[PDB]
Ligand binder design. Sequence first.
Ligand code: HEM
Ligand code: HEM
Ligand SMILES: CCCCCC[C@H]1C(=O)O[C@H](C)[C@H](NC(=O)c2cccc(NC=O)c2O)C(=O)O[C@@H](C)[C@@H]1OC(=O)CC(C)C
Ligand SMILES: CCCCCCCCCCCCO[C@@H]1O[C@H](CO)[C@@H](O[C@H]2O[C@H](CO)[C@@H](O)[C@H](O)[C@H]2O)[C@H](O)[C@H]1O
Ligand SMILES: O=C1C(O)=C([C@H]2CC[C@@H](c3ccc(Cl)cc3)CC2)C(=O)c2ccccc21
Lengths: 402, 438, 75, 19, 55, 124, 273
Amino acid sequence: FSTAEAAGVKVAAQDGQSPISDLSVVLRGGSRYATVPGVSHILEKFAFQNTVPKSALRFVRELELFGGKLYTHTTREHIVLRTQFLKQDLPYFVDAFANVLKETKFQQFELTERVAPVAELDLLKRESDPAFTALEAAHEVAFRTGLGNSVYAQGYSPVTLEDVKEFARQVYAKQNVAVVGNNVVPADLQQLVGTAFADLQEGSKVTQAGTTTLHGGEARVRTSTGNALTIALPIAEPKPVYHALASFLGGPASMPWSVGASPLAQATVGTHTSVKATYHNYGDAGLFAITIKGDSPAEISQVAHKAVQALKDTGAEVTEEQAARAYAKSKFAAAEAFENPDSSASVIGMELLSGVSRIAPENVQKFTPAELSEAAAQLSASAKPVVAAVGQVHALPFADEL
Amino acid sequence: VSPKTRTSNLKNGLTIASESNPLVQTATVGVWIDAGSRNENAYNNGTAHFFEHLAFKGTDKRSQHQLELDIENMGGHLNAYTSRESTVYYAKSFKDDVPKSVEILADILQHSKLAESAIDREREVITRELEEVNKQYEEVVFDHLHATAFMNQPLGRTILGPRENIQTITNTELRKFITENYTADRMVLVGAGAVDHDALVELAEKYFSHLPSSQSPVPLGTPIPNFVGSEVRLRDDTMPVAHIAIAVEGVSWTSEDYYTALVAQAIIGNYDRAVGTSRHQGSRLSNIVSENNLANSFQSFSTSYSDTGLWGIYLTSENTTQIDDLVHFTLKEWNRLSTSVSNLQVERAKSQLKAGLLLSLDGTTYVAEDIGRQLTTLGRRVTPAEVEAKLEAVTEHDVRAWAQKTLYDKDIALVGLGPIEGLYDYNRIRNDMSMMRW
Amino acid sequence: YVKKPSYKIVPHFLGFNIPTVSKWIPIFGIWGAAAGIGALFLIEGVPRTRQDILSKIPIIGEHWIREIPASDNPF
Amino acid sequence: GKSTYKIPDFTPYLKKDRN
Amino acid sequence: MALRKKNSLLNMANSYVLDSPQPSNLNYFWNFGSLLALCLVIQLATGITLAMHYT
Amino acid sequence: ASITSVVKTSELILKSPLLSKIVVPLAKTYVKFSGYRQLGFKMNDLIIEETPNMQLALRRLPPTESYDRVYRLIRATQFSLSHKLATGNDITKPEEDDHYLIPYILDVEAEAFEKDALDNLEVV
Amino acid sequence: VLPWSIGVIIFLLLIITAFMGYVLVFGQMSLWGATVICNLVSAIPWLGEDIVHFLWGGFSVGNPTLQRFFALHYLMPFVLAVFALLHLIALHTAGSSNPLGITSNVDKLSMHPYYSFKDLITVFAFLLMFTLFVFFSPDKLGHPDNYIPANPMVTPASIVPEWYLLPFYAILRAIPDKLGGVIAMVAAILILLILPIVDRSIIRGNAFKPISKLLFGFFICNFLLLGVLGQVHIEPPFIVLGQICTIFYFSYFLILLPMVSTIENIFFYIGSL
Ligand code: HEM
Ligand code: HEM
Ligand SMILES: CCCCCC[C@H]1C(=O)O[C@H](C)[C@H](NC(=O)c2cccc(NC=O)c2O)C(=O)O[C@@H](C)[C@@H]1OC(=O)CC(C)C
Ligand SMILES: CCCCCCCCCCCCO[C@@H]1O[C@H](CO)[C@@H](O[C@H]2O[C@H](CO)[C@@H](O)[C@H](O)[C@H]2O)[C@H](O)[C@H]1O
Ligand SMILES: O=C1C(O)=C([C@H]2CC[C@@H](c3ccc(Cl)cc3)CC2)C(=O)c2ccccc21
């Protein structure tokens, strides 16, 4: 991705040999920047609604004539709007993003009838997975505000059209926009973005209201639709070793119909439960989570004990073999992340919008057993452990039990 | 312009097909087999799926645990799926981990232990899978749809097989199955991503050279299906959403009408109320359904097999009192494929497909799945230029001709699952397959 | 590179356009034949229909040329 | 009796040339 | 629930002549509908009666 | 006829200096004689609403404007049945006769007519 | 539009019922009326003349015709009551309109007691007018000639149909062509079917449309003028006058209403800005 600049907008493109271009506008407008709860999700779903030049209807019907697709998501850090189209149709999609950032008519009816109902369906579909809810709840406990704001719009806290319009005034500005083109000729994109986003506000860098504070605690979301448990440990100093530790501890199977040879995977033997260790870097804070879903609260409780034991055992001793297995699983995770278009866009988005150089998969650091055991030790000896239980919460573990 | 798909053969008849992408750092190698559940008879139905479990249950060299560790150490993952006509076994890894993965795949396919102890262990695991697919409503509908459309024929069988078979599958009949079916002339080793073709052919010469060849080597994607217009209703008032599939006998991979049927499928299109853009799609049915809140979703499909296919639509709806309207309007939209379509719909759908057929291939696993699917169904990879030419050849007249012979006034296979009290009886649904006004 | 999709709106009226209607022109033809055949069939009994239409048809038309002998006709 | 994927026997009624 | 609403036959009468919700401001020109109904009833009564006497 | 039609045609008239000079005074007198203001209506209260499009426009009204519309219609219905006219504050003053609904129906219809147009597009 | 369109058919059926009933007296006007109505189908080319004979069941109006008119006059009112019921059922989806032409969904009243008691006032006012005719002047609305028995050899020199058919009769007289005259007369009723199309107003009804109310006043008065011209002698200058009134009648639906309704739309919008 040759990072450049076109009329004050950061543009990253990587030419390829494919008939398919993905052009992504990454906005520094994720939930951590959210003025009110859920507004970044609403703003994401309000992209490609009616603009002044072109109605949502006309946009969608013309996009289908080029056979383009549109995909949007919100993270805690960014909103990503990605279009997938054929190489040749690049100018149209550049101009369409320009129309979205410059001239979206945020009309109250779109919010009532179109955007809010779809945002509500988006979140209900995600919550069908109790693991999602547990990890969302865990961020809420761990960070409270900022990173702790919910990513998604919920019914209990309504976003008004004034809230979304205010947020979009800040976000839709040269300072918070990165254009990332996968399989786009970098010279051609700079020229197009330079003509299309010239009249975009300069605006200001969106900032998090307040610095990131970490906290421990418990969240007990009573659902009837599956059971999950996150054991999260907020990190005050995000380090790349937690990626290695996440991949080492593992949890998912690397083979169909198997358990896996990862410590967390071996914690699920005898149970129809899954486990996944994940680490989320947010620049200034981090979250190491171990999420356990399953249908039996008794099994989840059983696994949760084994899971925290596994982390303590890692703090004791890692073998050289295990450390190499971690390097391999971590390099692989980095590679497939840079391949998947959704995550790719946000990776380079981070690099462009913040300044955090992307760690290329070929440059992922090899962590010694010393460094990994040290990292697991810090986590086992965390002063602020978070535990988010979802489902039959009366039967799931509590933080002080773990 | 995508890079050229290179193709080589071995002596035994194993095809190696590769598409390099020097822009990515991972690589998906795998083996696509032109064999699946369809290749069983009624006694050993479920064997192919059974094998998929046992493939990862250890080999003559590496045990189950050693296997697990070897792949963990590689860094990527292995994955397999058995369908009715195709079995796939692939390994996504890093660029320089490809020799390990080809070696592991060659081992699990040729030199699987299939130990009585492991057969007996999986016999419970697979039995439990029979009562957990129950939840995947899409799959329940489509499994019933095949069962009914191809009543008592090989395609009509499920993949998991009946409970009875799972209890009686022996290592003998598993061995016999993979000896008869997983032959070199029926397999394609596919590499996509950071693979060199010449390197992959060397790996195939090293690992897949002692593969059995079949006695009678037919070309890849070589097949007698007699579709049954029929319905299954699985009424379940406790379910909130009704899932209905309707299908007619569709087209095989090699049909002259294959592209015409895809175009037709794109004219009806898909719809999902959860996607923001879907209320604005051009599809007539999409407009009717969204304006009237008739469905949560519909998804046209055209599933093809070597010698037949199903073409149809899969609907989900919570509007349980207007399912009659939903089915009515859907089939009236199919009728208009026969009576009304003109250059307006056809050119719009062709434009949406010209992109769609290339959009699908966006990661190394999708590319590999496309290479593998095409090589095992057509015997060659069809280049984007040839695909664009075949689509351009589809005219409005061709779509009308195809619809009039395939859809219009034809028997349908209808499966309804859930609160489908409101779905009328078979006659009234089938009566909508024609228009008295035409 | 393509800057804009290339299309026109065809003239339309009450949701009919000439492409669509032109595909139905044959069908109106057949329904007009069905209405013609059917109408003529309904009035085949009407004496004027025989006199002026049906008796004029070659070969077949003799079916409708029937005279009552004046010996058997009171009127 | 149990499996819903084993369509009941329709051979007494099914026409061979149905299509 | 009121009989007039429960019973299918009464419910049809009810919906026309009793509970039928009408705008509150209809003026006297909305009365012709019922006069035409009355004419129609008179015509049927006198008509059938004349038919008993007419040849 | 569609509100779009009426609004575009009105805009053609208000553009042409000659036309506006002769039509605007006519229309103002017409509206005075129309006398809907004497029942406390705004012009837009009189638009036929039993149409898909209009029902959708009326659902889009802000709650405030919607509640007030209901009140004006109730009040006018009551004047009508009593054969009285509005007096005092109930009479719609020219400054209160705002086109509260026109923006909503024009948006509804804009989309509906675009939808009809795009249903008839021909790839070139 | 549906109750309206069903209504237009009720209006045609009433005309045919009332006419078929007129013929049953078999006075002079009765027989002649029968002749003319049964000859309107002669307008229909080719088959026309044969249909006429078929509807008479003879070569002239005679016994056969009178007996079939009796059968149908008895029947037609029950058909008319069906259609009257149907147009109410069609109306029940939208409910009655109201004199403001706004929705009434905001303010509804039960049919009873309010309109039941309101309808009694007109029942009694109707019966007062009924009583004055029936008891005091039963023959004011009748034609003397119907008290002469039917003589197929003469038609009265003063042919004037029922007061209510007079408007369409003047229309039929106006047009000097056979088929023309018949078409125009039927079209004068069937043209009501197009009001839903040709009224281009965005506003329902005329309470608030001064120009439309004036146009409607002239249309109604013209329909009354046609009525009057239906009963004068066919002489100058009423021949030309009847033609002008016929053109005005049709031009209301075809020209004036579409134009006036378009202009008033614009006047409402401009006038209220
Ligand atoms: C036997 C003759 C008829 C009877 C008994 C009859 C009766 C009625 C009644 C009771 C109503 C509802 C109350 C009212 O509005 O007055 C009504 C409404 C209506 N009638 Fe008639 N009607 C007859 C003939 C006609 C004709 C000939 C037409 C049209 C040409 C017509 C059109 C309508 C319409 C459009 C309505 C709805 C009007 C509204 O309430 O705004 N009817 N009729
Ligand atoms: C809409 C309903 C009806 C209308 C408009 C209607 C109209 C008429 C008219 C105008 C006459 C000529 C009356 C005269 O000048 O003497 C008449 C006669 C007659 N009607 Fe009706 N009629 C209706 C319903 C009925 C019904 C239901 C019957 C049932 C048989 C009937 C039986 C008669 C009979 C027997 C005569 C001839 C005796 C006579 O002239 O009085 N009518 N009708
Ligand atoms: C006994 C139940 C059978 C249902 C049908 C009987 C009649 C029926 O429904 O009566 C109702 C009272 C109706 N009036 C109204 O809608 C009405 C509505 C609003 C305002 C007023 N008045 C205003 O001030 C009304 O008057 C009416 O007069 O219509 C007759 C014609 C109906 O006859 C038939 O269709 C069948 C047949 C005898 C014609
Ligand atoms: C002499 C002829 C014999 C039958 C004539 C009697 C009256 C005509 C009835 C036919 C119309 C019935 O058609 C249907 O009936 C139902 C049953 O009340 C009515 O239904 C109406 O009232 C009911 C309750 O009162 C409501 O739930 C409903 O929302 C409303 O539409 C309506 O009127 C009409 O939707
Ligand atoms: O010449 C006529 C004549 O024209 C009508 C006429 C007037 C109304 C016509 C009519 C009006 C409207 C319709 Cl929808 C159908 C017929 C029917 C024929 C008569 O009723 C008449 C009665 C007695 C003697 C002569 C005559």
